[PDB]
Design an enzyme around this catalytic site. Structure first.
Site, PDB file in Angstrom:
ATOM      1  N   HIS A  40       0.810  -1.209   0.000  1.00 39.94           N
ATOM      2  CA  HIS A  40       0.000   0.000   0.000  1.00 39.94           C
ATOM      3  C   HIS A  40       0.847   1.266   0.000  1.00 39.94           C
ATOM      4  O   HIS A  40       0.288   2.354  -0.199  1.00 39.94           O
ATOM      5  CB  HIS A  40      -1.042  -0.014   1.128  1.00 39.94           C
ATOM      6  CG  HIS A  40      -0.520   0.361   2.486  1.00 39.94           C
ATOM      7  ND1 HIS A  40      -0.187  -0.571   3.445  1.00 39.94           N
ATOM      8  CD2 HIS A  40      -0.314   1.572   3.062  1.00 39.94           C
ATOM      9  CE1 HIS A  40       0.192   0.052   4.548  1.00 39.94           C
ATOM     10  NE2 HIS A  40       0.128   1.356   4.344  1.00 39.94           N
ATOM     11  N   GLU A  52      18.792   7.572   8.544  1.00 45.10           N
ATOM     12  CA  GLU A  52      18.055   8.729   9.037  1.00 45.10           C
ATOM     13  C   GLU A  52      17.763   8.648  10.523  1.00 45.10           C
ATOM     14  O   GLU A  52      17.413   7.585  11.050  1.00 45.10           O
ATOM     15  CB  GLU A  52      16.698   8.828   8.337  1.00 45.10           C
ATOM     16  CG  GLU A  52      16.778   9.282   6.899  1.00 45.10           C
ATOM     17  CD  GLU A  52      16.985  10.778   6.773  1.00 45.10           C
ATOM     18  OE1 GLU A  52      17.385  11.402   7.777  1.00 45.10           O
ATOM     19  OE2 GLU A  52      16.737  11.311   5.665  1.00 45.10           O
ATOM     20  N   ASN A  54      16.652  12.380  12.318  1.00 46.12           N
ATOM     21  CA  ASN A  54      15.769  13.500  12.014  1.00 46.12           C
ATOM     22  C   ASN A  54      15.583  13.579  10.500  1.00 46.12           C
ATOM     23  O   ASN A  54      16.537  13.859   9.767  1.00 46.12           O
ATOM     24  CB  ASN A  54      16.331  14.810  12.551  1.00 46.12           C
ATOM     25  CG  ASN A  54      15.312  15.942  12.463  1.00 46.12           C
ATOM     26  OD1 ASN A  54      14.662  16.125  11.432  1.00 46.12           O
ATOM     27  ND2 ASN A  54      15.149  16.687  13.543  1.00 46.12           N
ATOM     28  N   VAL A  57      16.446  17.149   8.765  1.00 47.34           N
ATOM     29  CA  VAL A  57      17.767  17.749   8.889  1.00 47.34           C
ATOM     30  C   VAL A  57      18.798  16.751   8.388  1.00 47.34           C
ATOM     31  O   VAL A  57      18.756  15.577   8.759  1.00 47.34           O
ATOM     32  CB  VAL A  57      18.077  18.099  10.358  1.00 47.34           C
ATOM     33  CG1 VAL A  57      19.472  18.686  10.492  1.00 47.34           C
ATOM     34  CG2 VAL A  57      17.036  19.046  10.915  1.00 47.34           C
ATOM     35  N   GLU A  62      23.311   9.981   6.558  1.00 48.09           N
ATOM     36  CA  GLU A  62      22.332   9.542   5.582  1.00 48.09           C
ATOM     37  C   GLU A  62      22.977   9.005   4.309  1.00 48.09           C
ATOM     38  O   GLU A  62      24.061   9.419   3.902  1.00 48.09           O
ATOM     39  CB  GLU A  62      21.458  10.716   5.165  1.00 48.09           C
ATOM     40  CG  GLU A  62      20.631  11.303   6.289  1.00 48.09           C
ATOM     41  CD  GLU A  62      21.298  12.463   7.019  1.00 48.09           C
ATOM     42  OE1 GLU A  62      22.529  12.688   6.866  1.00 48.09           O
ATOM     43  OE2 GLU A  62      20.573  13.152   7.768  1.00 48.09           O
ATOM     44  N   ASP A  84       0.165  -7.683   1.745  1.00 49.97           N
ATOM     45  CA  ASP A  84       0.566  -6.275   1.750  1.00 49.97           C
ATOM     46  C   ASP A  84       2.080  -6.171   1.903  1.00 49.97           C
ATOM     47  O   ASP A  84       2.616  -5.836   2.965  1.00 49.97           O
ATOM     48  CB  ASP A  84      -0.172  -5.513   2.845  1.00 49.97           C
ATOM     49  CG  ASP A  84       0.034  -4.011   2.757  1.00 49.97           C
ATOM     50  OD1 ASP A  84       0.538  -3.522   1.715  1.00 49.97           O
ATOM     51  OD2 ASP A  84      -0.309  -3.317   3.736  1.00 49.97           O
ATOM     52  N   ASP A 171       0.535   2.055  19.852  1.00 49.55           N
ATOM     53  CA  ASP A 171       0.240   1.464  18.550  1.00 49.55           C
ATOM     54  C   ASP A 171       1.118   2.130  17.496  1.00 49.55           C
ATOM     55  O   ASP A 171       1.735   3.169  17.737  1.00 49.55           O
ATOM     56  CB  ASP A 171      -1.248   1.699  18.241  1.00 49.55           C
ATOM     57  CG  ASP A 171      -1.842   0.779  17.168  1.00 49.55           C
ATOM     58  OD1 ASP A 171      -1.152  -0.047  16.524  1.00 49.55           O
ATOM     59  OD2 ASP A 171      -3.076   0.915  16.982  1.00 49.55           O
ATOM     60  N   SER A 172       1.164   1.519  16.315  1.00 46.77           N
ATOM     61  CA  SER A 172       1.650   2.220  15.139  1.00 46.77           C
ATOM     62  C   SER A 172       0.507   3.037  14.548  1.00 46.77           C
ATOM     63  O   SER A 172      -0.631   2.942  14.999  1.00 46.77           O
ATOM     64  CB  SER A 172       2.205   1.231  14.120  1.00 46.77           C
ATOM     65  OG  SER A 172       1.211   0.318  13.689  1.00 46.77           O
ATOM     66  N   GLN A 174      -0.684   6.071  11.022  1.00 47.21           N
ATOM     67  CA  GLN A 174      -0.437   6.586   9.682  1.00 47.21           C
ATOM     68  C   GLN A 174       0.972   7.159   9.588  1.00 47.21           C
ATOM     69  O   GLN A 174       1.440   7.857  10.488  1.00 47.21           O
ATOM     70  CB  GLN A 174      -1.465   7.665   9.358  1.00 47.21           C
ATOM     71  CG  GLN A 174      -2.858   7.124   9.206  1.00 47.21           C
ATOM     72  N   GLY A 175       1.650   6.855   8.481  1.00 47.99           N
ATOM     73  CA  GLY A 175       3.018   7.264   8.272  1.00 47.99           C
ATOM     74  C   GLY A 175       4.048   6.264   8.743  1.00 47.99           C
ATOM     75  O   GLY A 175       5.210   6.351   8.329  1.00 47.99           O
ATOM     76  N   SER A 177       3.364   3.100   8.106  1.00 47.30           N
ATOM     77  CA  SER A 177       3.130   2.156   7.021  1.00 47.30           C
ATOM     78  C   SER A 177       4.421   1.711   6.366  1.00 47.30           C
ATOM     79  O   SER A 177       5.244   2.539   5.986  1.00 47.30           O
ATOM     80  CB  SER A 177       2.285   2.843   5.945  1.00 47.30           C
ATOM     81  OG  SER A 177       0.928   2.908   6.306  1.00 47.30           O
ATOM     82  N   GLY A 178       4.544   0.400   6.151  1.00 49.47           N
ATOM     83  CA  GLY A 178       5.679  -0.157   5.446  1.00 49.47           C
ATOM     84  C   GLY A 178       6.890  -0.442   6.305  1.00 49.47           C
ATOM     85  O   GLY A 178       7.806  -1.138   5.845  1.00 49.47           O
TER      86      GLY A 178
HETATM   87  N1  LIG Z   1      -2.670   0.664  13.986  1.00 49.89           N
HETATM   88  C1  LIG Z   1      -2.342   1.154  12.771  1.00 49.89           C
HETATM   89  C2  LIG Z   1      -3.321   1.638  11.881  1.00 49.89           C
HETATM   90  C3  LIG Z   1      -2.918   2.094  10.641  1.00 49.89           C
HETATM   91  C4  LIG Z   1      -1.575   2.074  10.279  1.00 49.89           C
HETATM   92  C5  LIG Z   1      -1.085   2.560   8.941  1.00 49.89           C
HETATM   93  N2  LIG Z   1      -1.838   1.984   7.841  1.00 49.89           N
HETATM   94  C6  LIG Z   1      -2.843   2.638   7.267  1.00 49.89           C
HETATM   95  O1  LIG Z   1      -3.221   3.749   7.627  1.00 49.89           O
HETATM   96  C7  LIG Z   1      -3.518   1.930   6.105  1.00 49.89           C
HETATM   97  C8  LIG Z   1      -3.109   2.573   4.772  1.00 49.89           C
HETATM   98  C9  LIG Z   1      -4.364   2.543   3.935  1.00 49.89           C
HETATM   99  C10 LIG Z   1      -5.452   2.823   4.939  1.00 49.89           C
HETATM  100  N3  LIG Z   1      -4.970   2.132   6.146  1.00 49.89           N
HETATM  101  C11 LIG Z   1      -5.666   1.661   7.201  1.00 49.89           C
HETATM  102  O2  LIG Z   1      -5.107   1.149   8.153  1.00 49.89           O
HETATM  103  C12 LIG Z   1      -7.185   1.648   7.166  1.00 49.89           C
HETATM  104  N4  LIG Z   1      -7.647   2.185   8.454  1.00 49.89           N
HETATM  105  C13 LIG Z   1      -7.659   0.184   6.993  1.00 49.89           C
HETATM  106  C14 LIG Z   1      -9.142  -0.065   7.120  1.00 49.89           C
HETATM  107  C15 LIG Z   1     -10.005   0.259   6.086  1.00 49.89           C
HETATM  108  C16 LIG Z   1     -11.361  -0.007   6.185  1.00 49.89           C
HETATM  109  C17 LIG Z   1     -11.870  -0.601   7.318  1.00 49.89           C
HETATM  110  C18 LIG Z   1     -11.026  -0.927   8.355  1.00 49.89           C
HETATM  111  C19 LIG Z   1      -9.671  -0.657   8.260  1.00 49.89           C
HETATM  112  C20 LIG Z   1      -0.686   1.580  11.211  1.00 49.89           C
HETATM  113  N5  LIG Z   1      -1.038   1.139  12.423  1.00 49.89           N
HETATM  114 CA   LIG Z   2      18.347  13.369   8.400  1.00 49.96          CA
END
Ligand SMILES: Nc1ccc(CNC(=O)[C@@H]2CCCN2C(=O)[C@H](N)Cc2ccccc2)cn1
Ligand SMILES: [Ca+2]
Length: 223
Positions: A40, A52, A54, A57, A62, A84, A171-172, A174-175, A177-178
């Site tokens: 994703h 990395e 910071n 900066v 890096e 994924d 928790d983890s 947004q951002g 991800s990956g």
């Molecule tokens: N605890 C966490 C949560 C999120 C993340 C980072 N990942 C994302 O944000 C991904 C990227 C695409 C969207 N997304 C999601 O997770 C949607 N909420 C999935 C979803 C969609 C529909 C129904 C339920 C669930 C990391 N740790």
């Molecule tokens: Ca840096």
């Protein structure tokens, strides 16, 4: 990362930032030429940023290396987030040192209850938004399959696992991800999805890397 701690500069030396004009995802360096991230996180025009702390900066350790190719898993389904996972090849090999280092792939899957390290530059708030500049870390245990399926009925496949805290707060997000989930010195997870961040009964869901080692090895052997 919500409810975590500042890792310490370059103490997660396999953590990379994916940059397309801005940080948009994490990843994990698995050898000098290849990064594992989430499918994703796919987009064109990726620059991989190694070494990395910071991300805003230039601090002196890096390495910035453009991707030459990205390979999303053939069976990735963006509707369910099954499979994924994505490989990114670097245009040139990274110089490995104490601050830029690969993380081993697993030979067996990790066990429920094992404490892992999750890291990233994602949002640090469970409600609202704040993005850190330095790398954040979280210790989190792998949750039982039963608790994972109960938290997300009908949505957990055998290629996913939950980790974190059912009470919320940590928790983890947004951002992140990956990015990596490392347990017992191996890359066992990729930050994949959830429902919000750090909410009660909605732990993070992670791609189960041990199911992909054969695909990773074959792919890097022919690309
Ligand atoms: N605890 C966490 C949560 C999120 C993340 C980072 N990942 C994302 O944000 C991904 C990227 C695409 C969207 N997304 C999601 O997770 C949607 N909420 C999935 C979803 C969609 C529909 C129904 C339920 C669930 C990391 N740790
Ligand atoms: Ca840096």
């Amino acid at each position: 990362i919500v409810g975590g701690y500042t890792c310490g500069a370059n103490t997660v030396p396999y953590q990379v930032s994916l940059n397309s004009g801005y940080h948009f995802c994490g990843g994990s360096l698995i050898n000098s030429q290849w990064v594992v991230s989430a499918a994703h996180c796919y987009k064109s025009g990726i620059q991989v940023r190694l070494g990395e702390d910071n991300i805003n900066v230039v601090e002196g350790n890096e390495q910035f290396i453009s991707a030459s190719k990205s390979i999303v898993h053939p069976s990735y389904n963006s509707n369910t987030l099954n499979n994924d996972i994505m490989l990114i090849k670097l245009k040139s090999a990274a110089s490995l040192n104490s601050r830029v280092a690969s993380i081993s792939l697993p030979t067996s899957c990790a066990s429920a209850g094992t404490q892992c390290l999750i890291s990233g530059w994602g949002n640090t708030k469970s409600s609202g938004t704040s993005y850190p500049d330095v790398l954040k870390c979280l210790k989190a245990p792998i949750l039982s399959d039963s608790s994972c399926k109960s938290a997300y009925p009908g949505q957990i496949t055998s290629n996913m696992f939950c980790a974190g805290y059912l009470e919320g707060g940590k928790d983890s997000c947004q951002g992140d991800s990956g990015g990596p989930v490392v347990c017992s010195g191996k890359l066992q997870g990729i930050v994949s999805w959830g429902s919000g961040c750090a909410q009660k009964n909605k732990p993070g869901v992670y791609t189960k890397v041990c199911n992909y080692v054969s695909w990773i090895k074959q792919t890097i052997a022919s690309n």
